[PDB]
Design a protein around this nucleic acid. Structure first.
Ligand SMILES: [Mg+2]
Ligand SMILES: [Mg+2]
Ligand SMILES: [Mg+2]
Ligand SMILES: [Mg+2]
Ligand SMILES: [Mg+2]
Ligand SMILES: [Mg+2]
Ligand SMILES: [Mg+2]
Ligand SMILES: [Mg+2]
Ligand SMILES: [Mg+2]
Ligand SMILES: [Mg+2]
Ligand SMILES: [Mg+2]
Ligand SMILES: [Mg+2]
Ligand SMILES: [Mg+2]
Ligand SMILES: [Mg+2]
Ligand SMILES: [Mg+2]
Ligand SMILES: [Mg+2]
Ligand SMILES: [Mg+2]
Ligand SMILES: [Mg+2]
Ligand SMILES: [Mg+2]
Ligand SMILES: [Mg+2]
Ligand SMILES: [Mg+2]
Ligand SMILES: [Mg+2]
Ligand SMILES: [Mg+2]
Ligand SMILES: [Mg+2]
Lengths: 99, 116, 208, 83, 127, 151, 100
RNA sequence: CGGUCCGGCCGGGAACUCAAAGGAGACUGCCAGUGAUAAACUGGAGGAAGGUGGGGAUGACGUCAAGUCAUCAUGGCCCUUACGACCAGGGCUACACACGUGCUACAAUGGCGCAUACAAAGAGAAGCGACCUCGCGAGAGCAAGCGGACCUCAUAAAGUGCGUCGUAGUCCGGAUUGGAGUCUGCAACUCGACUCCAUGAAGUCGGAAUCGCUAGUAAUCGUGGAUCAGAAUGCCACGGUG
C-alpha cells in the first residue's frame, strides 16, 4: 500500500489537491481509501510591534498546517508511476510511503 | 537523652529529636536509626539504655557539635587568610555566592543601615 | 500607531499572499531569505518598469516568479531578451532552476503600488505635493475606483515643521473585512528628507 | 565547578610558561591574562602577575592556593565605601 | 437496544448507553463508588435518574474522557439527559425545567497579552 | 452597577442534606477553590454540632444561624460635613449572608486546633448566644439605635 | 547593526564550519570514560589551540536583513520587526493574525 | 460482534468519542404586555444557545513637538593614522541607601510519609530521546522509536484514602554559609544552572497608604512554548478546582 501525506497552508488549496489525487488512482488503480483528515498544526507566534519600548503592544500570528492522509490499497503498475509523473500545485507537499 | 554532648528532647519522635544535634538532619537521622534498628515513630522516651548506647555510637561515626563548628570556622578562616574573592566576601560581610548586592542582601548585611 | 496594516489583516479573506509555497522549518528561513533577495534585485533592476507586485512560488525545488507590471514591453524588450537575462540571475540567487511569468496590469491608475510610486517620482523631481495628490485621486475615481485615499507625510516643500496631509474621495471602509482595499506604500528621498506616501484604493466588496 | 572527568583547566600558553620557569629557576613576575586557569602544585612559590582588567597584580602562590583559579586573587572591582 | 447520548462539559466528553435493568452504573469499567470519590460528583450523575423515578429502572455503561473530576461528572449528567430523551421523549418537558438539557458552554477564558491571567491586570501605580 | 439590576445565578444544594443554604455556607468557608476540604469541614463540624444538641443538623444549624442574623445595619451617606450612618433595613437574603460570614470570620479567630473544632464550638456558642459572632451582631445593633435619629 | 558586526558574524560561521569535524573528534575523546587519561589531557589542551570563533556557541543569531541581535525568531530568521513588515505585505506564506 | 497473552490487543466494526471540510442554527423570528398605530423595552415560547450567547481580532479626526537617528531608512552636522577596525582581560552582576514589579512564606482549609484518580495545549533532526543498566542524587552508559493523531519530551499537580505532627519560631519557613558533585560550554574566579550532605536568618499576616477583579471571573493548582550551548520567580499560552 501507499500512504500519501499532503501538507499545506490553504485548506481550499489542499482540498483542490486532495480530490485531484484521488481521481488519478481511482481511474488507474482501484480502491482509493479516502481523504482522511489529520489534526491541523497551529504554530502561533507573538512579537512586539513597537520598535523601541511598548511591552504590552503585540501581534499574535499563527500558521495553520493542514494535513491530509490518503491511502491506496492495491497499487497497480499505473498507480505508482502515473501518479509519480503527476505533479500538484505548490503549497501542497506530497509524501508517498511505499509499503 | 544525652547524645554527643548535648541533651535531646524526650517528648518528640526519634528522627526529629535527633536533628537537634548540630550536624545531622532529616536525612542523616534516618541513616542513624536504620543502622541502629530503631523505628522512627518512637520517642526518645521508652527507649532502652542499650538502644541509646547503640544510638551514641552511630552518631559518633560522623562529624558533630564540637568537631563541625571547628571545621566550618577552619574553612572560613582558610579563605580569610588567602585573600581570595570568597575571603573578601566573608570579611566584608557581603554575600559570597554571587547574589545581588544592589538590593535584597539583608541576610548577610543584617537590617538596614540608614544614611545619617 | 493606530491603524492595522490593511493588507495583512485581509490575507485570509480577500487578499492573497505574495508568496504561496510550503517548506518545513528546516528549509523555511532560507527560502524567506531567497524570496527577499529576488524581490530586492528585481525592484532595483525593474525600477523604470512600473512593477507592482512580485509573486513568488516554488514547486518541486524550482522557483516561479510572477511579475505584475503596467508595461511588459520594457520588461521583455525583444522576445526573450531581458526576461531571459533576468531569469538566469534569479537562478543564481535562488539556487534552483527559475521561471519568470509576467501578468499584465490593466488600469495602472487603480493599483496602489503604481500610484504611490507615481507620486514619489513626481515628488522626487520637485513638483508641488498638493498637485500630485489631486491628480492621483482624480485619475482613480475617473477610472472607476469606488474610493481612494492618498496620504503624504512629513517635510513637504522643504518646510521645517513636518506635517501630514491626506485626500479622500469616495468611501474607503477600512474596518470592513470583505472590502477590497488595495494598500501599498512608497517613500520619496528628497533633498530635504524622506517623504512617505500611503494610498488606499477601494474596488468593492467581495461577496464570497 | 568543572566535572571531574574533564580534570582541571589551564591555558597552554600558561602551562608552557610554568614549565619554563620551573626549569629555568627565575623569579621574575610572570604577567598573565589567564584568570580562568586552575593553579597547579608545581606553581607553588612563584610570583605570577594576574591581570584584573586594568593592570597586573602579583600573586605569590601558597600551598592552600592549589585548588582555585588565578582570577580569585585578582579582584576586578575597586570598592572603598560610600561615606 | 441500547440508547445513546453524548454529554459535554469544560473539556469532557461522556458516552452514555442506556439499557433497561437494575440501576448498575459502570464508568470506564469501574463502579460509581469507585470512580468519583467526591460525593458531590456522585450526586450530579444521579440527578436526572432521581428526577424521574428511574434509579432502579435502567442500567447504564459510560465512558468519559478529558477534563477533571467535576468536569467529567458534568458531562455524564448531560449525556444521561441526552439519552433519556431518546428513551422516552416525554421527559424533555421536565428535564428542560430541571436545567439539565442545556449544555453549559462555560469554557475557560484564554490568557491575554499584558494581563497576567484571563482578567487579572498587573498592579497599577501612579508614581 | 449603574445600568441594570441583574439576574442572580443558581446555586446547587448540598449533597448530604439537600439544603440550598448549607451549600451557600460551604462556599463562604471555601478558600482558593478547594470546595472538597470545605465540604469536609462543614460536614465534620455539623456532625459534632448535632451531637451536642440531639437535633437535626439542618435544624440545629439554623438555631445558631438565628442568633447572629442582624436586623438593621447602617451605611454611610455623608450629605453634611461629616459621615451619616443611616440605619437601613436589611433584606432577608443579606440577613442570611451576613450571618454566615460572621460565623466563619469568628471561627478563623478561635484558638482551637481543627477548623471543624473552631466552627462547631462557634456554632454551639451561637446557639448558646455567646461568642464573637453574636458580639458582631450586637455592635451592628448597638450602632443602629445609636443612629436611629437618622432616617 | 554595524557593518563590522555583521562581518564578524560571517567569520564566526565559516570558522565554526571549518574546524567542525576536528572539534567533535576531541569531544569524543574527552567524553569517553574508556580512554587514556594522557590523551584526554592532550585533547583538552588541543582544543584550546583551535580558534575561539570555531565554537557553535560563539556565534549569535542575528536578523538576516538588519543584523539585530535581539528579538530573533528561528523559524523566520528575522527579528520581530522585520517579521511584522514582511507578514503584513504577505511575503510569508500561511502567516496571518490569529484570534482564538 | 467472534477471539484472547485480558491489553482495542486482534480478527473486525463502523456506530460512538474524536479529527477536519462543507452545511444547518438565533433573526426580537414567533406569543403576550407597554409604547407615540413607531422605534424600542419588559416578560415566556421553543431551543444547545435569546436579544451583542461567550472570548478575540478590528482602534475615527486628532492630542501629547509622547516614544525610538541603538532594528532599519534618512536631511543636516561631525570623525577619517580615528569617533573607524582587530584581540585578550575586565565591566554591563559594584552597594551606606530609596522605589517599582514579582516569587516563596509566616502554617493545621497545613507540613510530612505511603497509596491512588482525573487534564488540556504544545515542541522535536547540530533535535526529542524510550526501554535496560549504573549512581542517594543531579546524571552517566548503551540505545530503540520518531520530521511525528504513531515515537519522545511526559509520571499533571491541587484532589482523594490512610498515617503523622498537635500551636511551638515548631516535623512551619527557607534565607545564608560550609563541604561534596553533575551538566553545559575553548572556559563557570569575578559571573551559570542543578544535585547531595550539613547549616536553619528574617518572618507569627504587615503603618500611613494602595491594587486587581462581576463567572468558569477572582482565588488557587500544576502543564507547555518562544528566546536559548547552558542559564527564569519574567513573558506568552494551556487545562484542573472554583
Ligand atoms: Mg541539626
Ligand atoms: Mg536540606
Ligand atoms: Mg492596534
Ligand atoms: Mg509587565
Ligand atoms: Mg506606591
Ligand atoms: Mg507603568
Ligand atoms: Mg550600517
Ligand atoms: Mg549564545
Ligand atoms: Mg420560558
Ligand atoms: Mg425566554
Ligand atoms: Mg467593529
Ligand atoms: Mg520629545
Ligand atoms: Mg571583548
Ligand atoms: Mg542590566
Ligand atoms: Mg524547547
Ligand atoms: Mg536506582
Ligand atoms: Mg495528599
Ligand atoms: Mg495530614
Ligand atoms: Mg520545613
Ligand atoms: Mg523573630
Ligand atoms: Mg505559629
Ligand atoms: Mg465588566
Ligand atoms: Mg533553555
Ligand atoms: Mg486558569
Amino acid at each position: 500500500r501507499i500512504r500519501i501525506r499532503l501538507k499545506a497552508f490553504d485548506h481550499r488549496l489542499i482540498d483542490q489537491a486532495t480530490a485531484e489525487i484521488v481521481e488519478t488512482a481511482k481511474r488507474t488503480g482501484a480502491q482509493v481509501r479516502g481523504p482522511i483528515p489529520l489534526p491541523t498544526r497551529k504554530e502561533r507566534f507573538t512579537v512586539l510591534i513597537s520598535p523601541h519600548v511598548n511591552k504590552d503592544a503585540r501581534d499574535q500570528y499563527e500558521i495553520r498546517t493542514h494535513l491530509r492522509l490518503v491511502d491506496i490499497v492495491e497499487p497497480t503498475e499505473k498507480t505508482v508511476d502515473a501518479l509519480m509523473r503527476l505533479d500538484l500545485a505548490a503549497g501542497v507537499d506530497v509524501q508517498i510511503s511505499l509499503g | 537523652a544525652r547524645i554527643a554532648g548535648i541533651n535531646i528532647p524526650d517528648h518528640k519522635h526519634a528522627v526529629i529529636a535527633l536533628t537537634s544535634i548540630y550536624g545531622v538532619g532529616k536525612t542523616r537521622s534516618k541513616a542513624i536509626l536504620a543502622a541502629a534498628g530503631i523505628a522512627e515513630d518512637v520517642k526518645i522516651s521508652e527507649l532502652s539504655e542499650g538502644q541509646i548506647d547503640t544510638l551514641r555510637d552511630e552518631v559518633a561515626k560522623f562529624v558533630v557539635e564540637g568537631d563541625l563548628r571547628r571545621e566550618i570556622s577552619m574553612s572560613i578562616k582558610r579563605l580569610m587568610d588567602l585573600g581570595c574573592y570568597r575571603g573578601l566576601r566573608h570579611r566584608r560581610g557581603l554575600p559570597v555566592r554571587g547574589q545581588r548586592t544592589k538590593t535584597n542582601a539583608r541576610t548577610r548585611k543584617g537590617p538596614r543601615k540608614p544614611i545619617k | 500607531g493606530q491603524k492595522v496594516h490593511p493588507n495583512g489583516i485581509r490575507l485570509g479573506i480577500v487578499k492573497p499572499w505574495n508568496s504561496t509555497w510550503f517548506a518545513n522549518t528546516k528549509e523555511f528561513a532560507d527560502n524567506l531569505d531567497s524570496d527577499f533577495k529576488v524581490r530586492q534585485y528585481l525592484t532595483k533592476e525593474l525600477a523604470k518598469a512600473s512593477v507592482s507586485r512580485i509573486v513568488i512560488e516554488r514547486p518541486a525545488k524550482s522557483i516561479r516568479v510572477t511579475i505584475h507590471t503596467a508595461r511588459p514591453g520594457i520588461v521583455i524588450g525583444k522576445k526573450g531578451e531581458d526576461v531571459e537575462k533576468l531569469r538566469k540571475v534569479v537562478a543564481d540567487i535562488a539556487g534552483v532552476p527559475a521561471q519568470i511569468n509576467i501578468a499584465e496590469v490593466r488600469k495602472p491608475e487603480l493599483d496602489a503600488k503604481l500610484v504611490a510610486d507615481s507620486i514619489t517620482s513626481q515628488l522626487e523631481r520637485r513638483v508641488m505635493f498638493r498637485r500630485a495628490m489631486k491628480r492621483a485621486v482624480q485619475n482613480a475615481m475617473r477610472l472607476g475606483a469606488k474610493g481612494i485615499k492618498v496620504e503624504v507625510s512629513g517635510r513637504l516643500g522643504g518646510a521645517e515643521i513636518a506635517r501630514t496631509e491626506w485626500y479622500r474621495e469616495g468611501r474607503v471602509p477600512l474596518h470592513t473585512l470583505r472590502a477590497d482595499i488595495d494598500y501599498n506604500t512608497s517613500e520619496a528621498h528628497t533633498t530635504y528628507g524622506v517623504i512617505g506616501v500611503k494610498v488606499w484604493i477601494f474596488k468593492g466588496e467581495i461577496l464570497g | 565547578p568543572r566535572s571531574l572527568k574533564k580534570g582541571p583547566f589551564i591555558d597552554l600558553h600558561l602551562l608552557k610558561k610554568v614549565e619554563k620557569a620551573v626549569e629555568s629557576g627565575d623569579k621574575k613576575p610572570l604577567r598573565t591574562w589567564s584568570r580562568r586557569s586552575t593553579i597547579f602544585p608545581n606553581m607553588i612559590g612563584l610570583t605570577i602577575a594576574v591581570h584584573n582588567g586594568r593592570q597586573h597584580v602579583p600573586v605569590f602562590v601558597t600551598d592552600e592556593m592549589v585548588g582555585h583559579k588565578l582570577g580569585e586573587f585578582a579582584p576586578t572591582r575597586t570598592y572603598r565605601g560610600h561615606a | 437496544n441500547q440508547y445513546y447520548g453524548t454529554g459535554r462539559r469544560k473539556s469532557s466528553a461522556a458516552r452514555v448507553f442506556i439499557k433497561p435493568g437494575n440501576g448498575k452504573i459502570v464508568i470506564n469499567q469501574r463502579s460509581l463508588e469507585q470512580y468519583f470519590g467526591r460525593e458531590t460528583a456522585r450526586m450530579v450523575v444521579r440527578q436526572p435518574l432521581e428526577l424521574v423515578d428511574m434509579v432502579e429502572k435502567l442500567d447504564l455503561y459510560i465512558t468519559v474522557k478529558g477534563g477533571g473530576i467535576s468536569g467529567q461528572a458534568g458531562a455524564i449528567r448531560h449525556g444521561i439527559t441526552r439519552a433519556l430523551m431518546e428513551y422516552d421523549e416525554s421527559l424533555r418537558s421536565e428535564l428542560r425545567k430541571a436545567g439539565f438539557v442545556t449544555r453549559d458552554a462555560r469554557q475557560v477564558e484564554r490568557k491575554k497579552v499584558g494581563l497576567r491571567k484571563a482578567r487579572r491586570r498587573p498592579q497599577f501605580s501612579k508614581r | 452597577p449603574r445600568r441594570r439590576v441583574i439576574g442572580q445565578r443558581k446555586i446547587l444544594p448540598d449533597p448530604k442534606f439537600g439544603s440550598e443554604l448549607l451549600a451557600k455556607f460551604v462556599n463562604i468557608l471555601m478558600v482558593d477553590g478547594k470546595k472538597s476540604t470545605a465540604e469536609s469541614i462543614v460536614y465534620s463540624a455539623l456532625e459534632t454540632l448535632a451531637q451536642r444538641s440531639g437535633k437535626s443538623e439542618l435544624e440545629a444549624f439554623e438555631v445558631a444561624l438565628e442568633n447572629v442574623r442582624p436586623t438593621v445595619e447602617v451605611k454611610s451617606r455623608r450629605v453634611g460635613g461629616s459621615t451619616y450612618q443611616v440605619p437601613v433595613e436589611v433584606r432577608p437574603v443579606r440577613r442570611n449572608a451576613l450571618a454566615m460570614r460572621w460565623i466563619v470570620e469568628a471561627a478563623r479567630k478561635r484558638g482551637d486546633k481543627s477548623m471543624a473544632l473552631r466552627l462547631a464550638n462557634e456554632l454551639s456558642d451561637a446557639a448558646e448566644n455567646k461568642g464573637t459572632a453574636v458580639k458582631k451582631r450586637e455592635d451592628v445593633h448597638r450602632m443602629a439605635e445609636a443612629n436611629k435619629a437618622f432616617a | 547593526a554595524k557593518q563590522s558586526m555583521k562581518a564578524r558574524e560571517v567569520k564566526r560561521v565559516a570558522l565554526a564550519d571549518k574546524y567542525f569535524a576536528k572539534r567533535a573528534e576531541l569531544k569524543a575523546i574527552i567524553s569517553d570514560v574508556n580512554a587514556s587519561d594522557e590523551d584526554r589531557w592532550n585533547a583538552v589542551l588541543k582544543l584550546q589551540t583551535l580558534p575561539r570563533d570555531s565554537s557553535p556557541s560563539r556565534q549569535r543569531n542575528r536578523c538576516r536583513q538588519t543584523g539585530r541581535p535581539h528579538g530573533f525568531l528561528r523559524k523566520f530568521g528575522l527579528s520581530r520587526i522585520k517579521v511584522r513588515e514582511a507578514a503584513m505585505r504577505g511575503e510569508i506564506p500561511g502567516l496571518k493574525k490569529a484570534s482564538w
